[PDB]
Design a protein around this ligand. Sequence first.
Ligand SMILES: NC(=O)c1ccc[n+]([C@@H]2O[C@H](COP(=O)([O-])OP(=O)(O)OC[C@H]3O[C@@H](n4cnc5c(N)ncnc54)[C@H](OP(=O)(O)O)[C@@H]3O)[C@@H](O)[C@H]2O)c1
Ligand SMILES: NC(=O)c1ccc[n+]([C@@H]2O[C@H](COP(=O)([O-])OP(=O)(O)OC[C@H]3O[C@@H](n4cnc5c(N)ncnc54)[C@H](OP(=O)(O)O)[C@@H]3O)[C@@H](O)[C@H]2O)c1
Ligand SMILES: NC(=O)c1ccc[n+]([C@@H]2O[C@H](COP(=O)([O-])OP(=O)(O)OC[C@H]3O[C@@H](n4cnc5c(N)ncnc54)[C@H](OP(=O)(O)O)[C@@H]3O)[C@@H](O)[C@H]2O)c1
Ligand SMILES: NC(=O)c1ccc[n+]([C@@H]2O[C@H](COP(=O)([O-])OP(=O)(O)OC[C@H]3O[C@@H](n4cnc5c(N)ncnc54)[C@H](OP(=O)(O)O)[C@@H]3O)[C@@H](O)[C@H]2O)c1
Lengths: 287, 286, 287, 287
Amino acid sequence: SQKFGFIGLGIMGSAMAKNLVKAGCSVTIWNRSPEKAEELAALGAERAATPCEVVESCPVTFAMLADPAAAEEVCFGKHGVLEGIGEGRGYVDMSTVDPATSQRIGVAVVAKGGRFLEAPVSGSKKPAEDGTLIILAAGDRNLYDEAMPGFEKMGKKIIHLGDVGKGAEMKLVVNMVMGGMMACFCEGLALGEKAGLATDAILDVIGAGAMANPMFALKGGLIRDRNFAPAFPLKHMQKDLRLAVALGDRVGQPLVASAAANELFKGARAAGFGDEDFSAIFKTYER
Amino acid sequence: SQKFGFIGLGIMGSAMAKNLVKAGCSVTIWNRSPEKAEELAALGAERAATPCEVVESCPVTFAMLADPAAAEEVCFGKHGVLEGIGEGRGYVDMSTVDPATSQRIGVAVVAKGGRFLEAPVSGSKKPAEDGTLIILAAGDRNLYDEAMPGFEKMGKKIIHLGDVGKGAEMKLVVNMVMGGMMACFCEGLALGEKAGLATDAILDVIGAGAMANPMFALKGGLIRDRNFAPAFPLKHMQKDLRLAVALGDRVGQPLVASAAANELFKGARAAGFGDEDFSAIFKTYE
Amino acid sequence: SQKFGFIGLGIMGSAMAKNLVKAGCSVTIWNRSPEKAEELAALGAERAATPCEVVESCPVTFAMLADPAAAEEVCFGKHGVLEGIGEGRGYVDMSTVDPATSQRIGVAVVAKGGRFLEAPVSGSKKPAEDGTLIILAAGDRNLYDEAMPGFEKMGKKIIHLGDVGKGAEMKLVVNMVMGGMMACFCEGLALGEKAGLATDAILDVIGAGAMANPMFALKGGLIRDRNFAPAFPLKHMQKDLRLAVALGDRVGQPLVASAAANELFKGARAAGFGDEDFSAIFKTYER
Amino acid sequence: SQKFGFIGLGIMGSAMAKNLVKAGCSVTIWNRSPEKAEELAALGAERAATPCEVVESCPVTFAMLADPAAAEEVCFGKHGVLEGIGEGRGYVDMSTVDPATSQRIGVAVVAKGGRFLEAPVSGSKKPAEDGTLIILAAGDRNLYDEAMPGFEKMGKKIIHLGDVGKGAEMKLVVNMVMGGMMACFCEGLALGEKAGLATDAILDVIGAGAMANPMFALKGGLIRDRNFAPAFPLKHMQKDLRLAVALGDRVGQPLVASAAANELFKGARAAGFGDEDFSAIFKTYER
Ligand SMILES: NC(=O)c1ccc[n+]([C@@H]2O[C@H](COP(=O)([O-])OP(=O)(O)OC[C@H]3O[C@@H](n4cnc5c(N)ncnc54)[C@H](OP(=O)(O)O)[C@@H]3O)[C@@H](O)[C@H]2O)c1
Ligand SMILES: NC(=O)c1ccc[n+]([C@@H]2O[C@H](COP(=O)([O-])OP(=O)(O)OC[C@H]3O[C@@H](n4cnc5c(N)ncnc54)[C@H](OP(=O)(O)O)[C@@H]3O)[C@@H](O)[C@H]2O)c1
Ligand SMILES: NC(=O)c1ccc[n+]([C@@H]2O[C@H](COP(=O)([O-])OP(=O)(O)OC[C@H]3O[C@@H](n4cnc5c(N)ncnc54)[C@H](OP(=O)(O)O)[C@@H]3O)[C@@H](O)[C@H]2O)c1
Ligand SMILES: NC(=O)c1ccc[n+]([C@@H]2O[C@H](COP(=O)([O-])OP(=O)(O)OC[C@H]3O[C@@H](n4cnc5c(N)ncnc54)[C@H](OP(=O)(O)O)[C@@H]3O)[C@@H](O)[C@H]2O)c1
């Protein structure tokens, strides 16, 4: 009987909101495109007209938006979060964004009388459905504690990393490694294909060794079957590497391999695989 | 007892031969630098003076050498394997090498009337010691069978990938992926550090998600502790990336990311870390 | 006598402003660090306390600032350009900046009653002293024409590329090539030296052939002299490549080589060479 | 009057040999594909059956072959140079090859009692036709002096760089820079196009500044015209980059930018552009 607001109902946000509804929470919902909202309304969610409406009437609102532009627009725009937020009500942006953007939103939220937490996550569509996300929160400690029962229905591992920005930083670091791994993994599979190796043979050897991981296992088979249905949209992976490179720029860390990965994913977007899974980068190598 | 030869007693070869001796094989050994052969001798292994002498004396001889140049010198060089091979005696080269190299060696061995099998391995120093290596054999099926009692004491998973060259291609492909992973893992750890995150915090997050793997777990802890004692020598990792990139060149596959990792490992070599663990590339981002 | 304002007196701006004074113009100037104004001051230039003061009192003001942040500060900041412009007085920003910020600045200036023109330049310290800069202007065509007497004393080739943003786009494209050229040039020299080749011999062979250019001729000589006094500060070259990569991201162009150059220049900054000439990247390839 | 052998009648060799024939030399020629000898044959050149036959009968023989594999097959193979050289007759290999290959050949040649000089060249099809090549010789000085009358009909600048290997190293260093700069140049034109800049405007701004060079000027025009008729075959550019990166590996020089260019040229080969001009790499940058 806890009440939560939820803003942004894409791949990740849709499954997360549904987990709050399945858990018995009363959930108030908003999405720029109505159709996705109409999906959860049918499940028992309450549908709000604007972001303003959601945070105007919910003690704690989660948001799961595409990128900094989306997060900023929803926050600062007409009928946005800033218009409805206040009197201690909390805004929890779980979108992957740059530390400067979450910090910017946090300040504005706090100036309106609200509280702000950032909580980017690790784990894709399936972990979102299963409620097994890893939640990387940073910011208001009281809001962290208050949002916890919500977090616990969305994730398995929930941590607090300190001041606003540290969560974004953790997320960007972790995803940079993932993007890099995926680029290299695909180069291996493509090279193997051209060398005359069977994919399953390669997958079998990797699976038996020190590099074995769930991501290689999952994506390996999907690549073999040439199924690139989006779990983590390729255009979002590229956005994340974009942000990781800007973080590197700011803190003075050269990132030769991760910058290469950024460019390769840009190639995949240009090729038209932007709305496909990020594993679709394999098709640029092949092709 | 079963008689085996063993050529090349570095980190890997030393640990492998010791398993053969431990299992009660009668092992004849050779290394370029004789000090490395002293430890095995003390365990009962018989020292030969040249590779030619090991291969003269043994029905099956394994080799675990640094690189293509090493493999070729031991094979084609004065008093090398070729001078001693014959009468169907078998040479099983387990060095990590390019396909052209192992094929060239096998052709020459077969021409001398010997049998040839390539068998590079996956798994590092600890797996070598424990005998839990993954063995990626390719070549003569009958020599594969004959070496099997040895393979079983050196490894836990043994497979045969087809014609000579297939073992080398598989090995290069998987190590290329590993080298890239290490490079990216390290960029992440150094970026996180400069952003002000705790190394243990990053490690924990990674260990909890879809990327988690034994390599990151072990190497992450050693990076945190600044311990870079060689398990897989950085110079050999770089060599493997070199070979992978050459293979890409031969089969018409661009490898932008893996080529970048190759150059970053070359940077680590130039900084003086070639004899440390390949995880020492981390220090170049530092 | 013709009167111009000038904002930002670094390596470029001070040289360009000197040319206007030498041409006989009455010049009003300003720099964040007032000490740098002292030389032009002795030359007859009148010193202003604020950018606001400069644009208050001049028909046309040129600016030559480090980067988008600096250009944004001077424009929108306290006592900035915005507080001063109006009644048709022109602002010509010659800073190297991304298309979006020059547009954002233009709209702001124009909404204040002022006129805006961007005009980034190509050519370093010596061309700036010699008045042989290439001027890549875009924006208010009328301001362009009134600015000409000034352009013609600062540069040799002056062109108009269309709407605000086109100048910046041309400038970033050209500098991206330059940065990538410098990185490849230095890799060659360092490789040559490590192979035991005399680097003067290398420079002679390049100079004799199809890729010979003034940049290689000069910078090669300086590298040989071990003279890295800044003509184009390395930190600014890195900034330009950063902006070029962002442009790539935006227009959907993967930039594998250029992105690599960006990272290599970041390494040069991490190594402490940011305030040396961009050719100092050579020292990262070495010793 | 002079008698010369010539081996390898590809794009460069046929043009070089014609210059010796036009100069009144008596020239004995050989090519793996004998039809490439037909034009020279009608010009009075004498057909040899095998490389060994050329080197049996000529005091000095030049070779202009594709790559290290070709150079070695011609030297060490059946009916090869080694079968025919001796009694001080000279072999001048002008192929672009790695130092260890040319040294290998030279040692085997000297063992047969012949003399050896490597002399790779800088300058493409047009300079080969005009006799305007830069010749980078290394090795036997007496042979250098003996071949000079031939070098003088084939090139304009002729230098001697020391022992065998120095010429190869110089050639590889210089070509590495040229390959990276082509890659960067093309990234810039492609980026500019996608930003809505006209390519002629970009060309004109570059040609006015410090980067201007004959290569950009020539290739820029042909890119604009989408004319990629081979002057320097793209597969050979890629082979040179391959060899330069291996040189880097051997002498302890990381080559981040140059290795990137190597991979991009590989991409162009994979798209089927291997036999077009190396400027065809541009076509991989724009679908
Ligand atoms: N997918 C994953 O595996 C995964 C994992 C961890 C983190 N993330 C992060 O989660 C966030 C969302 O990812 P996703 O995979 O769910 O993305 P998605 O399926 O593409 O959905 C993106 C969401 O953002 C909304 N949006 C975009 N621009 C907007 C704007 N201008 N105004 C209002 N809403 C806007 C979209 O609304 P519409 O429906 O109207 O288009 C949609 O709800 C991203 O930051 C992503 O990086 C994703
Ligand atoms: N270490 C690992 O985790 C790992 C894992 C899988 C595969 N491998 C592969 O296993 C092989 C051996 O690696 P390692 O880790 O054991 O390396 P190592 O400790 O460096 O030993 C390499 C061996 O090669 C020998 N060698 C080098 N050059 C030679 C030459 N010219 N002539 C004769 N012998 C020569 C060395 O002889 P000296 O003792 O006289 O110097 C030594 O016995 C390599 O191909 C490596 O890539 C390594
Ligand atoms: N140098 C070249 O060869 C070259 C060639 C073409 C174009 N450019 C471009 O021209 C522009 C100027 O470069 P430069 O070489 O002259 O650089 P510079 O010597 O380093 O100085 C740049 C100027 O920007 C000012 N500045 C930096 N941050 C500021 C801030 N926050 N608020 C107000 N002013 C600020 C500096 O003021 P202070 O004196 O107080 O530090 C200085 O006046 C840059 O965009 C550069 O990329 C340079
Ligand atoms: N083109 C340029 O702008 C330029 C400039 C400077 C240097 N170079 C270098 O000059 C050399 C010649 O190249 P090119 O431009 O003239 O290329 P090309 O037209 O492709 O000629 C290659 C030559 O090599 C021969 N060849 C290849 N493999 C052979 C083999 N296995 N056995 C015997 N002959 C073999 C070819 O014989 P077939 O006719 O039978 O195929 C042909 O004569 C190359 O090293 C190239 O890198 C080129």
